[PDB]
Each structure stands twice: as C-alpha cells, then as structure tokens.
Symmetry: D2
Subunit: 249 residues, 4 copies
C-alpha cells in the first residue's frame, strides 16, 4: 500500500509544488484548499490521470473559530476516508497581510493570521496524532521570523507560534514515532499582486543568486524531511533562504 | 509629574513585585486584575498610604474574545484617566496549564493560552502606541521557550508569539521612541498546587544556587529595562533564569 | 567526469560514513586522517575495489600552528592532484576532551580544540575558495547552546564553526559556493564508554532513545551537497532526535 | 572595603566608559591597555584624583601565543596586588579588521582576532576563577553575530566563540557563585579611520533614533549586570543595539 499525505493550501504556489513532489515520490495526496476550488480540482484531475484514485480535494476555511477543531479533524478524516491511512501532514496554508500597530476588524485579523498560521496547525497535529511506517509533520515556517517586516506583527506572531508548535510537538510526539519539522523559506514565490520592479528590489537582497526560491526548491526540502533520509531528524527547521536571513541592514 | 505604568495581572506574585518596584522608583501605577479584586485593592491601599493618589486598580478579563479589544483599550484608558499619561506597559498577565496533543474546551484553551498570553499583549501594545519622555513596553517572556515542557504546546506557542510581538513592536514603534523589551524568567514561584519533594527536583536543576527566582529578582530586570539606563535598548529579551535554559538534558 | 570531495577525519566513525556515502553517490574522495593510517588506507582500498582510482588518502595534523595554513593548503591541493577538481569540502575532523576552568599544556588545548575545530575549517575554506554544485559542510554541534560542564574550549570551537558557516555562506555566495552545517546531538558514543553510561545518554533522546548512527549524520550531509539543496546556504541542520529540545 | 574590577582595553572608547562607570559606582579599577599607554595613565590619574588609590594600569598584549596564559594570569594578579581582591572581570579588549576568504600573515590574523576576542577572555576567566560577595564576568559580545559583515569571518568567529565561553563559564562557575554574562552592542563608536558619509550610512540603519550607541550607554548595561539587581542573572547576553539586529536586508 502507498502512503498518504495531507497538504494544506495545496491548490497552487508552494502548496501545489509540495503535493506534486509528494505524489511523484508515490504518495496519495489530499489537496486541501479554501477559495481556490478551480485550481485544486484541476491539480487533482492532473495527478489522478497520472495514477488513478491517488488525489482528492478537501475544502476548509482555517480561520480561528469555535468550529475550527471540527474542520481540522475533518481534513485528517478525509485522508483516512480516501486512503485508509495518513502518513504525512504538511502545514502550508497561510493568511498573509499587514496589521499595522498605529477593511477587516482586528478580531478577524487575529482570527485569520493566528488561526491559519498557528492554531489550525496545532489542531491538525492533534487530529493527525490521535488518528494514528514513516510518520511526520512538516510546518511551513519563516526564515525571517527574527528580522520581522514593518507592520506585520500578527503574521510574525503566528509564524513564531508555529516554531513553538514544531518544537513542542516534536518533543511530545517523538514517543509515538511521529517526527515534526519545519521548512523555512526566506523569499520564494512573490505575491501575485506585486509589480516586477518591486519584486527585483527584494530579489537583489538574496546572497545566493539574487533570486527567490522556486516552489520546487522549497518542496525539495519538505521531501527530504519526510523521507527515510531524515529518520533521526525531529524538531529541526531547515532554512531554504539562499542566505537571506544572514544579511544585515 | 510622576510617570505612570500599567501592570497586567498585578494583584499577586510577579506582577505585584513589578508594581511595588515601579512605585518605589517613583511611578504612579495601574494595578490590573481579572479575578483578584480584593488583592489588587489591598495593594493600591498600601501604595497610596505611601504616596497619595499614586495607585489605582483596573478590572478587565483578559481571555481572547470579540470584547478583548475593548478590555485592552479600557486598561490603557484607565491610566490616562487616573494620571494623564501612560509611560510604561508591563504585559505580565499569564494563563498557564497543560494542553496534551494526544477540562476546558479547546476554544477556551486557545482563548486563555493564546488570548491572554499573546493577543492581549498585542492589543495593549496597539492601544498604548495609539495613545502616544521615556516610553517603553516590557513583555513577560519565557527563558525556556526553546526547550518546551511536555504537553504544554499551546502555552509554548503563545510565549513564542510574544517573542515575535516584542521584536516586531520594537522595530515598528522605535520611530515613536517607544522601546519594547522582554524579561524571561526560568523557574519562578513554584505552584502551591505542586508539593515540595517535587518542588526541589525542579529547584536542584538551576545552576545558580539551585533555587527559583524571587518575584523581586524578576522585577529588577523590568526596572532596568524601563529606566534611563536602558535608553538604547529595544528588542532585547533578558533571561533571569539562574542559568536554567543552559542546562542540557 | 565524477565530482570530488575532501572529507577531514575520514578514517573512522562519522567521517568514514560520510566519505562512504559520498563515494556511493558517485564522488571521488580524498580521505584525510591524522593518526588512523591503517583505517584510512583500508577505507581507500575498499572504495577503489568498488570503482578504480576514486579514493586517495591524505595525512595532516589539524592543530593550530604556523604550518597549519600550509597543511590545509596541501589537503585541498591533494584533491586537485588526485582528481583535477574539488567540488565538496566536509569539515569533520575534531579533537574532543574536557578543559576545566578550575596533561596537555593549556596552550596545547587551545591549539588542538580551537585549531582543528575552527581554525583548520577556516583555512580549508580559504584554500577551497581560492582554488575555484560547489559546497562546504561543517560538522557543528546541536548542543552548542546547552554546553557540557568543563568543555569550554570544545564549546568555543563549535560556536566559532557556526560563525564560519554563516560568514563564509555570505562571502562565498557570489561564487555559487554554498556553506552549510550538520549538527549532531549524540551520535556514535565512545566504544570504550561503559554500556551503562552509554544508556544514560541514549535515554535522554526523545526520538527512539538512542544515538544517531554515523550513516544518519551522513544522510544530512548527502542532502546538503545534492541538487535538492541548491538554494540552501548558511543553514545548520540538526540531526539530534529532538535532544536539543529537552530541558534539564 | 571597596570591590575591584578588571577592564581590558580600558584606555579608550567603550572600555574607558566601563572603567569610569565602575569607578563612579564605587569600584577600584585595573585599567588594562596594550598600546594606549598615555591614555591609560591619563585615565588612572583622573580616577585617582577623584578617590586616591583606586585605579591602576596594566600593560599586556592579548594576541594568542604560548605566553598568552602568563599575560592573562598577570592581568588578574595585578588586581590582587593593588587591591587585595578581584570581584569583576570585563573582557572588552578586541582586535577588529577584515580577513577576506579570497599586511598581516594569516597566522597573525588568527592569533590577534581569535586570541584577543576569544582565547584571552577564556584564560582571564580561568585565572579569575582560580584566584577565588558578588563576583561576575561581563563579556563584550556582538548583537550582529548571526548577521555577519562580508570579509570579517575571523572576527565573527572570535565573537561566536565568546558566546560559547559566556554560556560555558556561566554553567561551570555557578557553583562558585560567579555569574557570567554579555553585553552585545550593534554599532557604538565607529572606527577612527572611517569617513563621515559612511558613518551616517551605518547610523541611518538603527531604528531607535537613527544613531549609534554612546560608550556610556554600553557601560550602563555592564553596570546593571555586575550589580545586586542582576544576582539571578547568569548566561545572559543583553543586546544594546537600538533594534539594529532586528532589521532585515
Ligand atoms: N512565498 C514566500 O516568499 C514565503 C516566505 C516565507 C514563508 N512562507 C510560507 O510558506 C508557505 C507557502 O507559501 P506561499 O507563498 O505558497 O503561500 P500563500 O500563497 O500565501 O498561501 C497558500 C494558501 O494558503 C491558503 N489560505 C489563506 N487563507 C486561508 C484560510 N483562512 N483558510 C485556509 N487556507 C487559507 C490559501 O488557499 P486558497 O488559495 O485555497 O484560498 C493559499 O493558496 C506559507 O505557509 C508561507 O507563510 C512563504
Ligand atoms: N559523536 C557525536 O555524538 C557527535 C556529537 C556532536 C558533534 N559531533 C561532531 O561530528 C563530527 C564527527 O564526529 P565523530 O564523533 O565521528 O568524531 P571523532 O571520532 O571524535 O573524531 C574524528 C577524527 O577527527 C580527527 N582528529 C582529531 N584530532 C585531530 C587533529 N589534531 N588533527 C587532524 N585530525 C584530528 C581524528 O583523526 P585520526 O583518527 O585519523 O587521528 C579522528 O579520528 C565531529 O566534528 C564532532 O565534533 C559528533
Ligand atoms: N560598534 C562598536 O564599537 C561595537 C559593536 C559590536 C561589538 N563591539 C565590541 O565591544 C567592545 C568595545 O568596542 P570598542 O569599539 O571600544 O573596541 P576597540 O576600540 O576597537 O578595541 C578595544 C581595545 O582593545 C585593545 N586591543 C586591541 N588589540 C589588542 C591586543 N592585541 N592585545 C591587547 N589589547 C588589544 C585596544 O587597546 P589599546 O588601544 O590600548 O591598544 C583597544 O583600545 C569590543 O569587544 C567590541 O568587539 C563594539
Ligand atoms: N520571509 C518573509 N516574512 C515576511 C513577512 C512580511 C512580509 C514579507 C515580505 C514578502 C515579500 C516581499 C517583502 C517582504 C516577508 N517575508 C519575505 C521577505 C522578508 C524580508 C526580505 Cl528582506 C525579503 Cl527579500 C523577503
Ligand atoms: N519556564 C517555563 N516554561 C514552562 C512551561 C511549562 C511548564 C513549566 C514548568 C513550571 C514549573 C515547574 C516545572 C515546569 C515551565 N517553565 C518553568 C520550568 C521549565 C523547565 C524546567 Cl527544567 C524548570 Cl526547573 C522550570
Ligand atoms: N553534542 C554534544 N556536545 C558535547 C560536548 C561535550 C560532551 C558531549 C557529550 C558526549 C558524549 C556523552 C555525553 C556528553 C557533547 N555532546 C553529546 C551530548 C551532549 C549532551 C547530551 Cl544530554 C547528550 Cl545525550 C549528548
Ligand atoms: N556589530 C558589528 N559587528 C561587526 C563586524 C564587522 C564589521 C562591523 C561594522 C562596524 C562599523 C560599520 C559597519 C560594520 C560590525 N558591527 C557594527 C555594525 C554591523 C552591521 C551594521 Cl548594519 C551596522 Cl550599522 C554596524
Ligand atoms: Cl500554481
Ligand atoms: Cl488576568
């Protein structure tokens, strides 16, 4: 039997690259999505024509709410429903926008940036472990967590909380043989709405090649962490940042 | 006039010592409480008997909700109402208990462990800065953040979040001359819930004197950070842990 | 033609496993050693049986002195004379013993613990870079911020190696030379160490209650030098079973 | 009886401001120097005019050699000879200059940058402890140690080794009640050789006030760490960097 993986926010960009690379290694995959129904279904179709019955979609909003635990339990349940097992959880889904200290309410911003980035990852981890061989969880972290961007405090808080979850769950789940690790991009695929001239300003700051990470380059690191080549690795966050985090002001 | 300080969770233990010490240095103080009304009023009385009209109490329940933004606004407001200024915010209020990955509802667990530990400090920081000399904020961090205790993931996530806030807010509020720093205790006042045979097992682990920090040792570090002796210091987290975080397994 | 790797302290233990896995990946290998000539030679022979003229040995002491720069220049040179190229440098060699703050002279302890752990890696990095998927992998310590009692000079050396890893990543990036670290927690324990003591350390490891095999450490090194890690530089991968996350 | 302090590289700049403040706090001081003979003697005079018999000078080259241990033992001996005691060691002396990977030999560069920045602090710590109340050591670290400057690898290596020393000695010297801590500046007093346009380029990067730390601001943090207000603090490195280490590329 082939192993199964849940990837959150897997319809496009980095999430899709990870689901594709997992599927290419031989994983059956759950492609979780929020609004990107069209993109997600088309990915699933794509992968299913490669191998029949190896990809399903799963819709869920990961905003913090009182029914977030139910939603996260369901995401994991969908993997068991489809594939009778769940071996890998990748926490990739992320809300991302500024929340200046000095549109949406603050209660919504906390709910979205903390829920999707930290609370849903925590709840998914609970459901993944409670439902339970190379078992592991990989969290998409931020290489730049300790050199935060101006006006992004809630996002930064959620990514910091994600590091704590990675480390706490690695420690707590190690007795059950579940590894928990992180992949920390610096700059990878830039926001869709960003202009080119702004994109280059940011690219030029990367010491290694003055370019952003490709989605595949990020995916390669997730693949390593789930493989038998990382069997003793738990609680590690691998930066994939071409040295961005080492560059002073 | 005398500068004014807000200390959250100021009725007992560490918050009390901070409020007492700020007051001895010459601050006017807001003693915030949620449950401990009697103890907060008792403190204010002792501080006022020392210097008239220098200590007031403020009630606010710091558990994450749609009304947490209002509670946090109120706390900052009560300082400006009492003293006509707010120079110092000490984010000291803290919920603390386990949340095993494998009682309260998890919605309540998140409200308290992320709500009061990280979201309230964010909202208090916003309101402090919105309302604005030696201005600073001091956050009660955890020196053991990167060596988390088993089954304490939500606690640990909120304290990780707090580091993110400290660093993000330090950066974003610097242009206002607002400094944002942390004090990170190791072992503090051991739970009266705990016994004594157990209490020493945790005590003997501290390299410096095999004892816990007093609340006043913690407060000393807060006093330093708010003083004119730390006017170039922002984004720094001072461990007051007697060497604890440095001890390997 | 196949790429070429230099592995310091390659005769035994972690160094041997890395040299083997590199060789198995298709690398030609320079096997550096200090005192383990028999093990370094018999490793070269075994590898050369597998693929002819793919392994050589190179002797050098990595202690700090006025001749260390020449010794490190010669290690790098040997890879070029053997194989006509040098694509990978693994800084693995390590002196390891306690240096309490309160019968080697202290200046010898500095020479050995700082020279081999930090200074020799720096000089090798210099020679490697001047001579040019190029990368360097330094063997760091996952426990670098939770130091053992009475290992200050060892701990200083390993902390300095983090500095080197990050400084050289930044400085060599314009040449497309990546520089990374692999940080073990507990790996191969002294074979002389009593089993009962061996078990006190293993039990502290959350993942599996055992030390890392040499091969598991090597796997991280293989990942970092591969095409799967081409955007990775200045990164230090812990291979510690969660050890560094365990409080007192 | 007054306590006694050793400050290395105390003739000028930050070491001098540290000696001056220790002296103002009540300490007797050993003013160590290498080359700055006139300045060191000039400081001891200033200090002795203020309180007679409270300052001495001590010459030593702190470059790594087989006599470096004898020189470090001598610096510590000098304090005991003048004052009968030695309560505080400040490791401040530092060689600083680029050592690119691609007029000094590499031997001398290693000997100076590693010797002064790391080995000499190790040997002074050793001699200090061996010769043995509120005893402590303060090491002058670097806030930017994980964000290195291009071509400063050996200097950065020495500063990294200094962190390991700080933490290692904190653990090892705790049972003797000797605390070991660090002060980590970002930019303070800029190089003499440096031109003014360059100075303002670097100055402009500091979020808190767009200026470098004064020597006195660095000394304030050292004073806190040696004081009774830091008795439970060991193994801690306080940044005094105005937020510099928090700024992304
Ligand atoms: N890209 C970078 O430069 C970079 C840098 C640092 C860290 N990271 C981290 O790496 C990961 C992948 O990066 P990315 O750029 O590919 O991410 P992204 O495009 O910003 O987000 C990935 C997915 O997150 C999902 N999402 C957003 N809000 C959600 C919600 N409320 N509920 C459920 N899902 C929600 C979206 O799914 P739908 O489209 O279905 O709505 C989105 O497609 C993220 O976790 C990110 O934070 C990336
Ligand atoms: N084992 C662990 O639990 C662990 C944990 C943390 C970090 N590490 C690090 O991982 C790396 C490999 O570990 P290991 O345990 O396999 O190492 P090791 O057996 O302790 O040492 C490996 C080799 O280093 C060489 N070496 C020692 N002193 C030298 C000198 N003065 N000049 C030149 N070479 C010298 C020796 O070569 P010869 O035998 O030829 O004389 C020795 O065999 C090391 O850098 C180590 O510090 C290991
Ligand atoms: N921007 C900053 O200033 C900054 C930033 C980060 C960290 N730091 C650290 O903070 C500390 C103080 O900074 P600073 O700028 O005042 O330092 P500095 O002026 O550059 O050097 C301090 C003193 O160390 C002495 N010294 C140099 N080489 C020596 C040797 N080979 N043997 C004995 N003594 C030697 C010199 O003494 P003589 O003059 O008597 O010859 C010098 O006056 C240093 O440890 C530094 O690394 C400073
Ligand atoms: N890793 C990360 N965390 C971020 C938090 C808020 C904003 C960004 C961001 C995203 C795109 C372009 C610039 C900053 C964030 N990024 C990407 C990033 C951050 C800093 C820098 Cl200097 C770069 Cl070139 C990219
Ligand atoms: N700083 C901190 N964060 C914690 C998170 C969960 C539990 C504890 C804790 C508190 C009291 C006694 C034991 C563990 C936590 N502590 C206190 C603590 C942690 C680790 C150790 Cl070895 C000790 Cl003696 C005290
Ligand atoms: N990573 C590392 N750095 C060390 C520095 C000095 C000594 C040891 C060591 C080695 C073998 C057994 C115990 C400590 C060192 N180790 C291995 C180690 C360290 C701490 C712990 Cl709790 C374990 Cl189990 C292994
Ligand atoms: N803290 C520190 N460590 C250094 C290592 C090498 C060079 C410098 C340096 C000093 C003066 C001006 C620029 C870089 C170093 N500094 C000062 C410094 C480093 C980075 C930045 Cl952006 C700044 Cl304004 C100052
Ligand atoms: Cl896409
Ligand atoms: Cl409260």
């Amino acid at each position: 039997e082939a192993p199964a993986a849940v990837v959150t926010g897997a319809a496009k960009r980095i999430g899709r690259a990870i689901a594709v690379k997992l599927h290419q290694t031989g994983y059956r995959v759950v492609i979780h999505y929020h609004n990107s129904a069209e993109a997600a279904v088309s990915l699933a179709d794509e992968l299913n024509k490669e191998r029949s019955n190896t990809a399903v979609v799963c819709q869920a909003d990961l905003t913090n709410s009182n029914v977030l635990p139910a939603s996260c339990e369901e995401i994991i349940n969908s993997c068991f429903r489809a594939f009778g097992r769940c071996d890998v959880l990748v926490n990739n889904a992320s809300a991302f926008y500024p929340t200046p200290l000095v549109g949406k309410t603050v209660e919504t911003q906390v709910a979205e940036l903390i829920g999707t980035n930290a609370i849903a990852p925590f709840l998914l981890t609970m459901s993944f472990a409670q439902r339970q061989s190379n078992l592991s969880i990989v969290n998409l972290c931020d290489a730049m967590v300790d050199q935060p961007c101006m006006a992004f405090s809630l996002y930064n808080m959620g990514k910091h909380a994600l590091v704590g979850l990675t480390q706490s769950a690695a420690l707590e789940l190690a007795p059950y043989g579940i590894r928990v690790n992180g992949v920390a991009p610096g700059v990878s695929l830039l926001p869709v709405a960003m202009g080119e001239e702004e994109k280059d300003k940011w690219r030029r700051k990367v010491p290694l090649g003055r370019r952003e990470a490709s989605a595949e380059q990020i995916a390669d690191a997730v693949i390593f962490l789930v493989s038998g080549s990382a069997q003793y690795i738990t609680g590690s966050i691998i930066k994939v940042d071409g040295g961005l985090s080492l560059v002073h002001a």
